[PDB]
Amino acid sequence: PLNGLNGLKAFLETKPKEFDPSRFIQIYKDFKNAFFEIQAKVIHVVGTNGKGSTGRFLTLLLADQNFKVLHFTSPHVFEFRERFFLNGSVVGESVLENAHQQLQSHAFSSACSYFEYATLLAVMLAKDCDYLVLEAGLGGEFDSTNALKKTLSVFTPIDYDSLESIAQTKLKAMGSLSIIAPQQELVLNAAQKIAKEKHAKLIVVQNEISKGVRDYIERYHLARFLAMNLEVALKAFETLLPCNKQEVLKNLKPLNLIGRCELLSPNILIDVGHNPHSAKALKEEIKRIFNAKIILIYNCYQDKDAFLVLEILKPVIKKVLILELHEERVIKLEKLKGILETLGLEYALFEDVEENENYLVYGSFLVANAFYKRYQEK
Incomplete structure (x- = not known):
């Protein structure tokens, strides 16, 4: 077509x-x-x-x-x-x-x-x-x-x-x-x-x-x-x-x-936002849908309040997997690592999703679309 x-x-x-x-x-x-x-x-x-x-x-x-x-x-x-x-x-x-x-x-x-x-x-x-x-x-x-x-x-x-x-x-x-x-x-x-x-x-x-x-x-x-x-x-x-x-x-x-509060699969929630308001809503949707702490797949642009968003999500997040992005206005990797350390969130780089775990993919259109491509190629 x-x-x-x-x-x-x-x-x-x-x-x-x-x-x-x-x-x-x-x-x-x-x-x-x-x-x-x-x-x-x-x-x-x-x-x-x-x-x-x-x-x-x-x-x-x-x-x-x-x-x-x-x-x-x-x-x-x-x-x-x-x-x-x-x-x-x-x-x-x-x-x-x-x-x-x-x-x-x-x-x-x-x-x-x-x-x-x-x-x-x-x-x-x-x-x-x-x-x-x-x-x-x-x-x-x-x-x-x-x-x-x-x-x-x-x-x-x-x-x-x-x-x-x-x-x-x-x-x-x-x-x-x-x-x-x-x-x-x-x-x-x-x-x-x-x-x-x-x-x-x-x-x-x-x-x-x-x-x-x-x-x-x-x-x-x-x-x-x-x-x-x-x-x-x-x-x-x-x-x-x-x-x-x-x-x-x-x-x-x-x-x-x-791409807003979207269940791509039974274990993957996807959202293109990056706002305290959307982060609060996704926390509530994580509680409803998974009723447990899940893994966050995350990156953000340099102009956004990453600290507050991650602080809002932390009560339902057990680990953050950073989705490596080299596009230019993305937050610098070591700065993001320092925010996660201030917040007490375990982290690592994202590579693959496990079927036994649940995930929120969050941060931007870029984060969601780049995740989707890697997820597509399996």
Whole structure:
């Protein structure tokens, strides 16, 4: 399907995943000429944390109103097609290969970067959708998703050169109508200044969780996801559909994201997070699922509070197996060893999983995807 000489998998391998802002603007113009100007209303999800859950919550609410929605996310945990959540499910392989087959014969498709091609695939897949929930990549203000006309932007919490510089690149591409989750003070200030400069409407989400959202989270034991992420998605929903007065949380299905609190096997739990909030939720899920101390397979980036996360997990962790990663912004090995020694956690390097033991794989998309490849090859 996605395989073969002309398949999508081979085409993506000609685009090694790791600069010309004018490129995709030109690519997208050619796409619209050669194909179509998408009619779906486009929601641009921009931020540092909570992009995935905020966007998927909004997608689920819209789908519950019998709307056709595509949710475009990045990166992926196990398979590339995770990036396209179409009409309530991950896109089928043959549907994705068919979109690729239509695109690949055009020059602008060969000019695409890896992520730029994924963006065009999302637009192709969403041709007949009512809404396109479009998560920004790492391109900043020149991100490929910036080239599509937007109905609404949703700014999830922004965090870590400087924080002001991060906020600037994300917020500068705000359109006429945007929802902003609770932010740090300088980020809210920067957003308000830009909105005034652009005559735009900025809807500031109150730092407040409704009973309906609390009830939904407790009813499904969804502590894995910040309640505020659903509050922001609900505000987006109400902003898109101001005439809807239904109690949409009562029949909202439980949120499930691939690679979040996911049992890959009876003895392997996998999660791409790295946060005190997700660590607490995984501790609780470890207690429910295994009801014993387990082994942690772990690494993290240099910018994260590894100490606190490991301290939170320690009560249910008997040993840490460090998943050696040489990518550059990963924490240095000896520094991580010192945190584990401060905490009193036995550790070693990860090599293989034993069938008689239980494991949590945790730390990043990178940690989970790199584990999965080594696990795949047995």
